[PDB]
Amino acid sequence: MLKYIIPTIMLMPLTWLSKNNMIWVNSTAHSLLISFTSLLLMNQFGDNSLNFSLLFFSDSLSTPLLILTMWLLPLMLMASQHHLSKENLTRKKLFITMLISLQLFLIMTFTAMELILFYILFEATLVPTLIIITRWGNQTERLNAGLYFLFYTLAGSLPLLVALIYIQNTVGSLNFLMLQYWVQPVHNSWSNVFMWLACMMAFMVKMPLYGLHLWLPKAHVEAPIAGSMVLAAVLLKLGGYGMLRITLILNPMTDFMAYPFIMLSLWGMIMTSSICLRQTDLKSLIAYSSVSHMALVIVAILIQTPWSYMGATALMIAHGLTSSMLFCLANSNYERIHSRTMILARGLQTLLPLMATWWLLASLTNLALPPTINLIGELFVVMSTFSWSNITIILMGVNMVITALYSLYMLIMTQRGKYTYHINNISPSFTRENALMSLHILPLLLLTLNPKIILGPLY
C-alpha cells in the first residue's frame, strides 16, 4: 500500500511548501492524481484477495472504500476553500493537513491485515475529525458536538480493545487471513455474550445504530462542510467495514445476538425516515437520512447472506456519494443565506436553474431510483431480508414510501414554490459549485454501467 501511503504523506510537504496563493491548486491537483492511481487496486481475483505484505492487503470490500476515500479528498478541498478564504494562511495549511492525515489513517484502516492495527488506525481518525469540528466549526455548540462524538466512540472502542487483545491471547493471532482458517465456533455462555457485545458495539456506534445515533445529528449540524463530507461518506462506513470483518469470528452466536439489533434497525429506519419529514434544519434532515439508510446496512450485515453482503457493500458506496452530495448542496445554499433552516429560502429553482437540476438528481438517488446503485444496494438487502423473514417486506416497503416522501419534500420545499421576497443575495452558481456536484453525481451514475466493482467479495 506504500504506493498510496507515501504519496498521501507527500501532500503535506506539497501544501506547506506551496506558494501562498497556490495551496488549494496544488493540493487539489495532486490529490486527484492519487485518486487516479487508486484504480490499480482493482486487480481482484475470484478466490484470493490482494495481499501486498504482512501489514496491508486489499480485497473487493476495501477497494471500493479506498477509491471512495481518495476521491473525497479533492472534493473536500473544493468545498472548503470558500469559507476558509479569509482564514490565516498558516491555519489554512493546518486545515488541509488535518484532511490529509485523515485520508492517511483511512486508507491504512481499510487495508490493515491485523485487527489491532485496524483498531489503532480506526481510533486515530477521531483526532483529525474532532479537531476539524471544534476548531473550524462556526457555532457555540461545536464544542459539545466534539465531546459527544469523542465519548460515544470511545465508550464502544475501549471494550473493543479489550476483546481484541483477549482474542489474540486465546487464538494466537489477529491477522485477518489467519482468522479465516483458525476461526472456531462461539458457544452459548454469558462470557461469550459479552465478548460478542464488545466486538460489535464500537462499530454499531459509528454506523450509527438507532438508539446510539444522537451524536450524529449534533456533529453534522456543527461541522464544517468538509467535516460533514468525510463524516457521512467514509467515517460512517468504518463501522460497516468493521462489522463485515469481525462477524467472521462471532458465529454461530450472531444467530440470536443479532435479534435486538435487527429490531432496532428495522424499527429505527421507519422512525428516522418519519423524523426526516418534520425536520426544520436542512443539515439535520440529511443526518437523520443517513441513520435511516445505515440501518439497512446493519440488518444486512447481521443476517449474513451472500445477497445481504453484496447489498450492504453497494449501499455504503452509494450512500457515501449521495450523502456527501446532499451536504454540499445544502452548503451552497448556506454560503448564500447563512442559515440551515429548510423553509427560509424557497423557490430556488427560479433563481438557480442548474443547481435545481443537481438537487433533483441527488434526491432521486436518495430515494433509490432504478437502476442507480442506491437502488441496487437497497434491493439486494430487501431480497435477502425477505428470505430471512417474509414479514420484513412490510417494514422495508413502508420505508421506501417514507423515503420518497421526505426526499421530494426537501426538493419541493427549497426548490419550488415562490421565492422568498426579502432574500436578494442569491448570486448565480459558481463554476466551483457546479463542478463539485458533477463530481459526486457523474461517478455515482457511471457505476450503474459496471456495478460489479462495488458489490464486494461475495460477488
Partner: peptide, 19 residues
C-alpha cells in the same frame, strides 16, 4: 455569519475557584 468565539460570559465559566 463569522465563526463564533468565546466571549467574556463564556470565559468567566473557568475563572472561579471551582468548575
Amino acid at each position: 455569519a463569522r465563526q463564533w468565539q468565546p466571549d467574556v460570559e463564556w470565559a468567566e465559566q473557568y475563572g472561579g475557584a471551582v468548575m
